[PDB]
Design a protein around this ligand. Structure first.
Ligand SMILES: OC[C@H]1O[C@@H](n2cnc3cc(Cl)c(Cl)cc32)[C@H](O)[C@@H]1O
Lengths: 297, 262
């Protein structure tokens, strides 16, 4: 691999450090995304984790890192090209909705990708629709591993400031010393609800607002539902105590199997929350297939 | 608890067992290095231990750095005057990979006593990354140790700290320890700690998990036991000092067993 073989097509995104281009390999024809990483503290730790972790993670539902081109002044990551992110797809499906067969296909694939990460001791820690990429053949893939982390068993304390707020698990919000694979499941559950409604489940504007939004939907957790909760660093006894909603009112269009799965993905207690691996076998997926997206990308 | 990832720990252990074979340094590399010796390496790692202590880095970070150093030295000849530059770059990369708050590059330049420049440290970082092909997520003795700890009944803090202490000691001496895999040194260290502290042995539950028995562990166990017995005499002492600290329950003050009865 070398930069001279690539013809740039257009810009397709940005982050840090931080521009992403769609390009094409002049010799093979292959269309790729080039994530440019501009190089006073040397190679950024986010790039180091992203590259080293993605080189181990080869799976149909994890974005494929093809190559790393590392000049002295520049670092280019070459990924397989994927046409759209799930957020843009949901916006483009407004007023119509995403067909249930596609929602089910996407969730099933996301769970496969995530189970594979967790089996390889990787926490993603930034699952949100903007970081989930779809192609024209019906695949959806985990992307943006800059915030990911290789974990140990049992986990140690890691960075506290993780996961975009709307998708952040209650154990992170309440300052637990340890968090684990369950935080990625919480995020997928929020994403599941969002695919059905096309709006964020818990759109808070601050950590406390975010907590209270969760509490008003699922009930303020107590020692019965979540042993240890009143002992956590950022739990306050002054928290309002909201009743738990009938789950059928949380995402009304969802059938019984759907509701069952969503509820197990949004369980308060991280120890009880369903795992990706176990979720693959949920009756919700009894009829799952993999259709192409219903809209042009 | 989900903190011990019950649904994945078996998959994870299996995966680390595969990766440790792929991430293993070349057992015989030192003889192929014209200008450096096991003893120079020992001095380097002992220094890294001190650096880790000064900056309150995780033990895991130290284990990763040593892995990077040994893999790098498996393919690149290095002059004695550059060995510390390799080690500093490795410790910087390990910190960026593993630490919540890695030290700044400036701080790494500082602890080398202005022997190297910031530009040298950063250029070496790049070379190490290139030589390692960015493959930094390597299994360490510590990653196996923390899983083995889950098999204690009940958990014992002295056992855990002593096992980590024994594991660290092995990082210093490429001969003989380069010949054993992390999972095996960890198993030997765990058995030796358990035996020293409680009189118990490598439990059946870990035979089930690892397929290792005291017979398969014997060679490493005999070496680790010698190392433990000679530790007060060793030219390098940073690890013993480190493990006198209450943080590690002062386990380096415990007396080794005279005999193993294996
Ligand atoms: O930092 C990378 C940014 O680029 C966006 N992006 C858009 N299309 C993409 C296609 C691919 Cl294959 C990738 Cl890896 C990122 C993409 C990602 O969604 C992110 O916002």
């Amino acid at each position: 691999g070398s930069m001279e073989n690539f013809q740039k097509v257009e810009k397709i995104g940005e982050g840090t450090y931080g521009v992403v281009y769609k390009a094409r390999n002049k010799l093979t024809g292959e269309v790729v995304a080039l994530k440019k990483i501009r190089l006073t503290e040397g190679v950024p730790s986010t790039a180091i984790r992203e590259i080293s972790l993605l080189k181990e993670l080869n799976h149909p539902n994890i974005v494929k890192l093809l190559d790393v081109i590392h000049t002295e002044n520049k670092l280019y990551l070459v990924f397989e090209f994927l046409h759209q992110d799930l957020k843009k797809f949901m916006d483009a499906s407004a007023l119509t909705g995403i067909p249930l067969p596609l929602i089910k296909s996407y969730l099933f694939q996301l769970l496969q990708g995530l189970a594979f990460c967790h089996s390889h001791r990787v926490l993603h820690r930034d699952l949100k629709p903007q970081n989930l990429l779809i192609n024209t053949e019906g695949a959806i893939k985990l992307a943006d591993f800059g915030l990911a982390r290789a974990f140990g068993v049992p986990v140690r304390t890691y960075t506290h400031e993780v996961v975009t707020l709307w998708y952040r698990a209650p154990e992170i919000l309440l300052g637990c010393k340890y968090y684990s694979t369950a935080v990625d499941i919480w995020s997928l559950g929020c994403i599941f609800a969002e695919m059905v409604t096309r709006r964020a489940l818990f759109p808070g504007d601050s950590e406390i607002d975010q907590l209270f939004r969760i509490f008003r939907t699922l009930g303020t957790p107590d020692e019965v539902v979540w042993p240890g909760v009143t002992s956590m660093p950022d739990y306050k006894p002054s928290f309002p105590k909201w009743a738990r909603q009938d789950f059928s009112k949380v995402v009304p269009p969802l059938d019984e199997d759907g509701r069952s799965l969503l509820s197990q993905m949004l369980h308060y207690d991280p120890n009880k929350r369903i795992s990706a691996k176990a979720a693959l076998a949920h009756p919700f997926f009894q009829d799952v297939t993999k259709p192409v997206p219903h809209l042009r990308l | 608890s989900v903190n011990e990832v019950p649904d994945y720990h078996e998959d994870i252990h299996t995966y680390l067992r595969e990766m440790e074979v792929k991430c293993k340094p070349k057992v015989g590399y030192m003889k192929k290095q014209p200008d450096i010796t096991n003893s120079m390496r020992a001095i380097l790692v002992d220094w890294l231990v001190e650096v880790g202590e000064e900056y309150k880095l995780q033990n895991e970070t130290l284990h990763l750095a040593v892995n990077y150093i040994d893999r790098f030295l498996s393919s690149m000849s290095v002059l004695r005057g550059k060995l510390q530059l390799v080690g500093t770059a490795a410790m910087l990369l390990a910190s960026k990979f593993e630490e919540i708050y890695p030290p700044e590059v400036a701080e790494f330049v500082y602890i080398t006593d202005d022997t190297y420049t910031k530009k040298q440290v950063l250029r070496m970082e790049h070379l190490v990354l290139k030589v390692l092909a960015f493959d930094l997520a390597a299994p360490t003795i510590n990653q196996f140790l923390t899983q083995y700890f889950l098999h204690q009944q009940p958990a014992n803090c002295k056992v855990e700290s002593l096992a980590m202490f024994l594991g660290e000691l092995s990082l210093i001496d490429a001969d003989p320890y380069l010949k054993y895999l992390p999972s095996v040194i960890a198993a030997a260290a765990f058995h030796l700690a358990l035996y020293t502290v409680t009189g118990q042995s490598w439990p059946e539950s870990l035979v089930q998990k690892t397929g290792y028995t005291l017979e398969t562990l014997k060679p490493c166990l005999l070496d680790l036991h010698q190392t433990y017995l000679r530790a007060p005499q060793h030219a390098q002492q940073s690890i013993r000092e480190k493990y006198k600290n209450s943080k590690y329950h002062g386990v380096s003050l415990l007396n080794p067993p005279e005999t193993l009865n294996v």
